[PDB]
Structure 1
């Protein structure tokens, strides 16, 4: 009936197939990416184990190397914060109590983290935390809005890079550092977490004391998984 209705409702007709074809075609990649990575991870921890176990029994040792990513969360509130510890907590995107970020661990970021330590409980993430934090608390920053990740399509949208497609590419550069670690995090909205379920018992002291703040190494995972 409507002259342009067909010139419309036929265009909608093939844009629907374009969606469905460009959807189920993404699972194939999202599937063969995850596969590639899961096998990639067991091919590492099982390499260290064989490699560690050789340095033992011959009287050698094995360096764990140096962790690269570090999860950082802010244990104090906003009050009575000095000028240089504002400007650092802002450049780390931690603007709020119990925000969290993933950052490289290198000399400029190491020396930057120790000036704010009274504010910061940080450490070295598991793979279980990154998955949990990129899935459950993951929010992409799209056009200025903080939007939850309900889908693998929107990730491929924001990042046109096509080394980041599914949520399992997200976790990868987060976990393994790598090339796109910045442009993946920098597009994540900084994590917002609940308080720890059972608690620290003294936010005001360093962890190596009856304290929270500072570098608690891998015990951050155990501490962080209470926030999620």
Structure 2
């Protein structure tokens, strides 16, 4: 009976340790969320003031070029050339209405230009990033696709003091921080539903009244109907 007694004794301490760890993680997540919200608001206000100062003297303010793009696949798997097939596989878009986040730098842009008839992409907003993470976000755990349900599994997956909560993931993705690749590589590709209300024309570019190609900031209205 001593084996049973010792096992029970250790189980009690394990329970109390789990509760204490949960309580600590909650406070850390709270503080980080507050910090990020204040940072975003301050950034927007500073940009507004810079634009006003330029306009008052009649100059112009150049916006920073976008750093993040959101890309979704809009065609099925049929009659695809080997080069396009390879690029779509490397972007992890193997099924219609799969979506990912990528860095918007020179190698990525030249890869994206080669598969334009197959994709729709643009520049996401903070609300879009939050919605995708909170509602459609899954992690690669042990090889499996596991839905996000608490901050503890995020912390266990990433094992990094800079990624412990969903708001940390959101911040890294949205601002293209130092751990952009770590966070995005750690997730399963997003699997979305068809856009409610329909599309316009799969076979034409967005500029010609169709759907494929770069539609800039207007990708957010598109994705709000798919998430």
Q: Residue 64 of structure 1: CA displacement? A: 1.2
Distance 1:88 1:100 in 2: 14
The C-alpha deviation readout for 1:196-227, integer Å capped at 9, x for no partner, is 01122201111011111111000000000100
Distance 2:218 2:5 in 1: 62
Moved more, 30-39 or 56-65: 56-65
Instruction: Give ranges in structure 2 of 5+ residues lacking alignment.
Output: none
Distance 2:161 2:142 in 1: 19
2:129 aligned with 1:130, yes or no? yes
The C-alpha deviation readout for 1:49-83, integer Å capped at 9, x for no partner, is 01111111211111111110110000111111110
The C-alpha deviation readout for 1:113-157, integer Å capped at 9, x for no partner, is 010111110000000000000110000111110000011100000
Q: Residue 25 of structure 1: CA displacement? A: 0.4
Distance 1:192 1:40 in 2: 30
Distance 2:62 2:191 in 1: 34
Q: Residue 32 of structure 1: CA displacement? A: 0.5
SS, match of residue 218 in structure 1? helix
Distance 1:53 1:92 in 2: 40
How many residue pairs get matched? 227
Structure 1 outlier segments of 4+, above 4 Å: none
SS, match of residue 136 in structure 1? helix
Distance 2:4 2:57 in 1: 80
SS, match of residue 57 in structure 2? coil
1 or 2, which has the higher helix percentage?
Answer: 2
Distance 2:198 2:55 in 1: 38
SS, match of residue 195 in structure 1? coil
2:205 aligned with 1:214, yes or no? no
Distance 1:87 1:78 in 2: 13
Distance 2:89 2:213 in 1: 18
Distance 1:213 1:63 in 2: 27
Distance 1:6 1:166 in 2: 37
SS, match of residue 56 in structure 2? coil
Distance 1:63 1:144 in 2: 44
Aligned counterpart, 2:46: 47
TM-score with structure 2 setting the length: 0.99
Q: CA RMSD of the aligned region, Å? A: 0.7
Instruction: Give ranges in structure 1 of 5+ residues lacking alignment.
Output: none
Q: Residue 37 of structure 1: CA displacement? A: 0.3
Distance 2:95 2:175 in 1: 27
